[PDB]
């Protein structure tokens, strides 16, 4: 049902299992209901979780899709995480 | 309409959605399924305001257009250890580093 | 291969920019060469005289990020029973979206001055372009 994603600084993010398996990397780390990310801090991993929600909500919707916001101060680390998770 | 939430306590953050018409108590039932603590051991907050079990999320100001998938609204959560409720504490996420000179 | 058909049958169309980007409409001419048309501000529309079987795609005018039109990549005017061309943001991958934000902040000369794995250098430099997108036949 839910899985726990733990950031490098110890924040625990609990997201729906279906949303987490969007990432092929997470699917492999799970297959446990818990994944530790030694390299991804909480200000990045929280944004990753909001991307999951946004993606699931707006994929295959013929309404108007809003832009996914990314503050400049986190963009570089978010890019690294997205590159690693293939997100 | 769906509202998208982060339910936060200490260093725990639950990402979930709920209906604007669903109640605060029904959200505690969601928290219960996840963190295994019954509703009577939970207090839910909007900022510093304690939320009443019978109110709907919409009445408490969680609306589909503010509690968005890409920018969810925060619900604070506090547990009763046995007697008395802990104070509401939410640990902030980490701080981003300084913007590199090229930016 | 990706070529407008010279039907000479008029087809009236409305470009409707339902995105937050300034939109560059691109007509693929009879030789397959992309032809740019006047840009559309966000949330604005325009009535266009086109032809059945012609081929159009749509891009962010500043960055050439790909956009969707009626939920696909190409728009082909059909028989007027005007045709609505709803231009929208795709759901970008998180990676592509981050590349978009980083490109908007860092000068292309300075991509190599960023502390990231080298494969991300090439991703940043491999910016979107209709010319690459047209190849996939
Ligand atoms: C602050 O560090 C990060 O955001 C980060 C995550 C990750 O994964 C592979 C490399 C890498 N860097």
XYZ file of C-alpha atoms and ligand atoms in Angstrom:
339
model
C 0.000 0.000 0.000
C 2.573 2.593 1.163
C 6.384 2.621 1.137
C 8.806 4.705 3.162
C 11.512 6.760 1.451
C 14.198 8.038 3.847
C 16.373 11.035 2.983
C 20.052 11.475 3.807
C 19.190 13.703 6.783
C 16.696 11.170 8.204
C 13.339 12.556 7.040
C 10.919 9.722 6.355
C 8.583 10.191 3.376
C 5.610 7.825 3.199
C 4.100 7.639 -0.291
C 1.738 5.267 -2.050
C 3.543 2.167 -3.311
C 2.142 2.719 -6.828
C 3.548 6.258 -6.902
C 7.020 5.117 -5.835
C 7.218 2.334 -8.448
C 7.074 5.071 -11.098
C 10.849 5.157 -10.583
C 12.558 2.081 -11.995
C 15.434 2.688 -9.612
C 13.074 2.654 -6.608
C 11.372 -0.522 -7.856
C 14.797 -2.197 -7.884
C 15.724 -0.878 -4.427
C 12.411 -2.195 -3.096
C 12.603 -5.504 -4.994
C 11.341 -4.271 1.713
C 8.877 -1.397 2.192
C 11.662 1.051 3.060
C 14.394 2.687 0.918
C 17.273 4.770 2.317
C 18.838 7.474 0.110
C 22.274 8.346 1.520
C 22.732 11.048 -1.122
C 19.346 12.747 -1.428
C 18.482 15.356 1.235
C 14.938 16.075 2.371
C 14.553 19.386 0.475
C 15.103 17.319 -2.693
C 13.282 14.095 -1.844
C 10.127 15.956 -0.775
C 10.049 17.516 -4.250
C 10.525 14.085 -5.821
C 7.445 12.894 -3.941
C 5.432 15.896 -5.133
C 6.516 15.050 -8.697
C 5.062 11.520 -8.271
C 1.714 12.981 -7.234
C 1.748 15.498 -10.082
C 2.697 12.865 -12.673
C 0.017 10.387 -11.604
C -2.602 13.146 -11.431
C -1.921 14.770 -14.800
C -0.798 11.893 -17.031
C -3.568 11.089 -19.538
C -5.667 14.160 -18.738
C -6.944 16.313 -21.593
C -7.533 19.281 -19.316
C -4.946 22.008 -18.682
C -1.700 20.827 -17.080
C 0.121 23.320 -14.815
C 3.875 23.767 -14.881
C 5.838 21.699 -12.382
C 7.618 24.322 -10.236
C 11.285 24.022 -9.290
C 12.924 26.738 -7.195
C 16.355 27.765 -8.565
C 18.133 26.920 -5.294
C 17.156 23.220 -5.508
C 17.246 22.701 -9.280
C 20.803 21.368 -9.482
C 20.400 18.749 -6.744
C 16.926 17.812 -8.014
C 18.461 17.226 -11.455
C 21.051 14.911 -9.919
C 18.366 12.956 -8.081
C 16.131 12.762 -11.155
C 19.094 11.598 -13.239
C 19.927 8.866 -10.704
C 16.310 7.717 -10.172
C 15.558 7.980 -13.924
C 12.522 10.116 -13.028
C -12.730 17.295 -5.563
C -9.407 15.876 -4.414
C -7.086 17.757 -2.062
C -3.412 16.827 -1.864
C -1.753 16.823 1.536
C 1.436 16.298 3.450
C 0.664 15.024 6.941
C 3.700 15.942 9.014
C 4.962 15.058 12.490
C 8.588 15.390 13.635
C 10.593 13.815 10.772
C 7.602 11.915 9.252
C 5.762 13.205 6.173
C 2.818 11.305 4.651
C 1.863 12.228 1.071
C -1.797 11.467 0.471
C -4.979 12.826 -1.062
C -8.507 13.100 0.288
C -11.824 14.566 -0.693
C -12.685 18.143 0.166
C -15.916 16.736 1.636
C -14.140 14.143 3.790
C -13.755 14.840 7.500
C -10.855 15.428 9.846
C -11.752 12.202 11.604
C -11.656 10.308 8.323
C -8.118 11.666 7.790
C -7.102 10.331 11.192
C -8.383 6.942 10.022
C -5.967 7.231 7.064
C -3.106 8.108 9.425
C -4.132 5.138 11.570
C -3.812 2.707 8.681
C -0.283 3.992 8.046
C 1.275 4.827 11.408
C -0.839 2.426 13.560
C -2.099 4.960 16.099
C -5.859 5.309 16.703
C -7.687 8.601 16.087
C -8.124 9.350 19.787
C -4.319 9.366 20.035
C -4.026 11.957 17.232
C -4.365 15.714 16.943
C -4.455 17.273 13.459
C -3.553 20.903 12.837
C -3.780 23.522 10.175
C -0.781 25.655 11.102
C -1.308 26.154 14.837
C -5.082 25.572 14.806
C -6.359 22.277 16.230
C -8.834 20.686 13.795
C -12.212 19.304 14.966
C -13.046 15.692 14.048
C -16.413 16.480 12.470
C -15.310 19.280 10.201
C -14.689 18.714 6.520
C -11.293 19.396 4.971
C -12.889 22.096 2.823
C -14.324 23.884 5.885
C -10.832 23.766 7.418
C -9.489 25.548 4.341
C -7.961 22.627 2.417
C -9.320 23.296 -1.076
C -8.644 21.577 -4.368
C -7.089 24.731 -5.738
C -4.737 25.342 -2.749
C -3.916 21.757 -1.759
C -2.388 20.937 -5.171
C -0.604 17.743 -6.374
C 2.586 19.625 -7.139
C 2.230 21.890 -4.059
C 0.291 20.056 -1.335
C -1.006 21.606 1.836
C 0.491 20.639 5.183
C -1.480 19.005 7.987
C 0.347 18.973 11.301
C 0.099 15.822 13.402
C 0.698 15.249 17.138
C 0.452 11.973 19.085
C -0.732 11.104 22.609
C 2.045 8.987 24.153
C -0.255 7.531 26.840
C -1.391 10.449 28.949
C -1.218 14.010 27.518
C -0.496 15.007 23.909
C 2.986 15.980 22.869
C 3.295 19.503 21.584
C 3.058 19.846 17.813
C 6.577 19.634 16.365
C 7.451 19.517 12.656
C 11.144 19.302 11.774
C 11.899 21.523 8.766
C 13.397 19.992 5.664
C 17.072 20.605 4.967
C 18.233 23.982 3.647
C 19.405 24.248 0.029
C 23.029 25.324 -0.462
C 23.920 28.757 -1.778
C 23.217 29.279 -5.466
C 26.417 28.499 -7.416
C 28.076 31.572 -8.871
C 26.766 30.564 -12.305
C 23.008 31.061 -11.676
C 8.937 11.561 -44.778
C 7.418 14.187 -42.415
C 5.916 16.371 -45.102
C 2.801 18.481 -45.603
C 0.544 17.132 -48.332
C -0.123 19.734 -51.061
C -3.894 19.239 -50.971
C -4.864 22.858 -51.790
C -8.066 22.226 -49.794
C -8.490 25.024 -47.231
C -8.955 24.046 -43.610
C -9.576 26.762 -41.039
C -8.003 26.192 -37.624
C -7.691 27.967 -34.256
C -4.383 27.629 -32.418
C -5.312 27.760 -28.741
C -2.309 28.220 -26.439
C -3.483 26.561 -23.216
C 0.065 26.562 -21.804
C 2.133 29.063 -19.802
C 4.791 29.209 -22.558
C 5.075 31.543 -25.527
C 4.297 29.103 -28.337
C 6.137 28.886 -31.684
C 3.947 27.182 -34.308
C 5.989 25.311 -36.910
C 4.639 24.318 -40.320
C 6.400 21.439 -42.079
C 6.497 22.525 -45.707
C 6.140 20.311 -48.793
C 9.878 19.497 -48.645
C 9.708 18.675 -44.927
C 11.509 21.872 -43.898
C 10.206 23.438 -40.645
C 8.741 26.898 -41.200
C 8.201 29.103 -38.117
C 5.053 31.184 -37.728
C 4.266 34.180 -35.453
C 4.404 33.261 -31.755
C 1.382 33.011 -29.415
C 1.391 34.529 -25.923
C 0.286 32.218 -23.108
C -3.463 31.788 -22.849
C -4.091 33.390 -26.241
C -5.586 32.105 -29.475
C -5.243 32.792 -33.192
C -7.319 31.994 -36.280
C -5.169 30.425 -39.006
C -5.924 29.575 -42.624
C -4.357 26.160 -43.273
C -5.030 23.162 -45.517
C -6.125 19.567 -45.132
C -3.175 17.220 -44.700
C -0.774 19.932 -43.674
C 1.519 19.210 -40.730
C 2.157 21.400 -37.688
C 4.091 21.042 -34.463
C 4.458 23.425 -31.526
C 7.368 24.460 -29.354
C 8.260 26.874 -26.605
C 9.362 29.902 -28.625
C 12.340 30.685 -26.404
C 13.760 27.251 -25.563
C 12.155 24.932 -28.168
C 10.844 22.603 -25.445
C 8.293 20.273 -27.017
C 4.589 20.946 -26.505
C 1.504 18.863 -27.125
C -1.334 19.751 -29.473
C -4.582 17.836 -28.924
C -2.508 15.568 -26.650
C -0.056 14.495 -29.404
C 3.050 15.871 -31.097
C 1.667 16.682 -34.563
C -1.490 18.490 -35.670
C -2.993 17.784 -39.084
C -5.889 20.040 -40.167
C -8.832 17.943 -41.342
C -12.171 18.576 -43.053
C -14.197 21.419 -41.533
C -17.529 19.807 -40.622
C -12.959 25.445 -37.746
C -10.638 22.844 -36.151
C -9.400 23.434 -32.592
C -5.636 22.903 -31.958
C -5.316 22.798 -28.169
C -1.691 23.485 -27.305
C -0.665 22.247 -23.837
C 2.283 21.393 -21.637
C 3.209 17.721 -21.652
C 3.933 16.014 -18.372
C 7.717 16.342 -18.701
C 9.913 13.818 -16.954
C 11.323 15.258 -13.765
C 14.764 15.048 -15.384
C 13.751 16.956 -18.510
C 11.991 19.557 -16.362
C 15.121 20.053 -14.218
C 17.235 20.402 -17.382
C 14.746 23.070 -18.495
C 15.171 25.033 -15.252
C 18.972 24.666 -15.171
C 19.261 25.740 -18.840
C 17.140 28.819 -18.028
C 19.605 29.801 -15.279
C 23.096 28.887 -16.562
C 24.789 30.219 -19.686
C 25.681 27.394 -22.107
C 29.389 28.290 -21.835
C 29.171 27.571 -18.098
C 27.477 24.157 -18.152
C 30.914 22.585 -17.594
C 31.494 24.759 -14.508
C 28.709 22.909 -12.630
C 29.504 20.116 -10.162
C 27.584 17.186 -11.668
C 28.320 13.873 -13.375
C 29.659 14.309 -16.907
C 26.708 12.579 -18.592
C 24.602 15.505 -17.274
C 26.904 17.882 -19.163
C 25.812 16.286 -22.406
C 22.153 16.260 -21.407
C 22.293 20.018 -20.704
C 24.037 20.738 -23.998
C 21.742 18.478 -25.972
C 19.037 21.127 -25.850
C 15.676 20.518 -27.585
C 15.525 21.271 -31.320
C 12.876 20.530 -33.947
C 15.660 19.282 -36.105
C 16.461 16.309 -33.826
C 12.753 15.673 -33.131
C 11.918 15.423 -36.836
C 14.253 12.452 -37.140
C 12.549 9.356 -35.731
C 10.650 7.875 -38.751
C 22.661 16.684 -2.770
O 22.851 15.506 -3.463
C 21.904 15.051 -4.357
O 20.854 15.658 -4.530
C 22.192 13.816 -5.145
C 21.376 12.698 -5.239
C 22.028 11.796 -6.068
O 21.964 10.575 -6.640
C 23.075 10.359 -7.381
C 23.881 11.483 -7.281
C 23.224 12.386 -6.453
N 23.296 13.604 -5.884
